[PDB]
Amino acid sequence: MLLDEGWLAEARRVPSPHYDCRPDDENPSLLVVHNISLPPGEFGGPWIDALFTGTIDPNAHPYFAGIAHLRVSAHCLIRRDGEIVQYVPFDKRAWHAGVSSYQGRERCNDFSIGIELEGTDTLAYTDAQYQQLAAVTNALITRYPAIANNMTGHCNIAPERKTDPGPSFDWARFRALVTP
């Protein structure tokens, strides 16, 4: 599917304040796969959208207090039913990696795009999510050729800090649907 001025043509647009420029206005070359669930283990709620736009209610759930002090964001979320939500245009810097490193290069926010799958490290992701993530990645690949050769997990760039997307993420099934 197509890209429209840095946005997904087939995604809900949820413009977050949480973003800034990529240095040198560099084109992103890496894809970083994440997972997220709020509160942990639960799906469907409004909390992901809120955390990413800086408006989560610290008090809504015991878990949220901690993350309110956070200022994070991703480019896209793909929900359990496959719904795609976008928060940042791809040309811009979302705040999804944190302290990280790929192939010698730190600060992966700089040169990566970050896509989250609603889910956990130990729960299976859905058929919709596999199809949708593939769609999106094929899109990016058309735009940024280099991403074909650079696709990783948050756990792979922040080892012993992050575990997402976990053993649950079937890299076999995912590559298969990519660069068709």
Give the residue numbers marked as catalytic.
116
Nearer to Zn ion, 37 or 126 (CB): 37
x-or-dash pattern for Zn ion, window 33-62, by CB under 5 A?
-x----------------------------
Q: Does the footprint of Zn ion cover residue 75 (CB under 5 A)?
A: no
Q: How far is the CB of 9 from Zn ion (least distance, A)?
A: 25
Q: Which range of residues in 53-61, 63-71, 149-157, 169-177 is near Zn ion by CB under 5 A?
A: 149-157
Compute the distance between CA of residue 165 and CA of residue 33 in angstroms, rounded to an integer: 7
List own/partner pairs for 12-16 with CB under 8 A and 24 or more apart. Answer: 12/83, 12/84, 12/85, 12/86, 13/86, 14/49, 14/52, 14/53, 14/85, 14/86, 14/87, 15/87, 16/52, 16/53, 16/54, 16/73, 16/87, 16/88, 16/94
Q: Does the footprint of Zn ion cover residue 154 (CB under 5 A)?
A: yes
Which string of DSSP letters, residue by residue, matches 33-67? EEEE-SSTT--S-SHHHHHHHT---TTSSTTHHHH
Q: Which of residues 158-177 bind Zn ion (CB under 5 A)?
A: 164
Nearest to 8 by CA among 121, 109, 142: 142
Q: Which range of residues in 9-17, 18-26, 153-161, 169-177 is near Zn ion by CB under 5 A?
A: 153-161
Nearer to Zn ion, 34 or 79 (CB): 34
Find out whether 34 is annotated in a ligand binding site.
yes
Q: How far is the CB of 171 from Zn ion (least distance, A)?
A: 16
Q: Does the footprint of Zn ion cover residue 18 (CB under 5 A)?
A: no
Could you list the residues that contact Zn ion (CB under 5 A)? Answer: 34, 154, 164
